Amino acid sequence: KWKLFKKIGAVLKVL
């Protein structure tokens, strides 16, 4: 949810 939620949301982009 925190700083990785931001790193995980972008992976959405990287996906």
**C-alpha distances in Å from residue 2, one per residue of 7, 10, 12, 14:** 9, 13, 16, 19
Q: Is the dihedral of CA 5, 9, 11, 15 positive or negative?
A: positive
DSSP 2: -
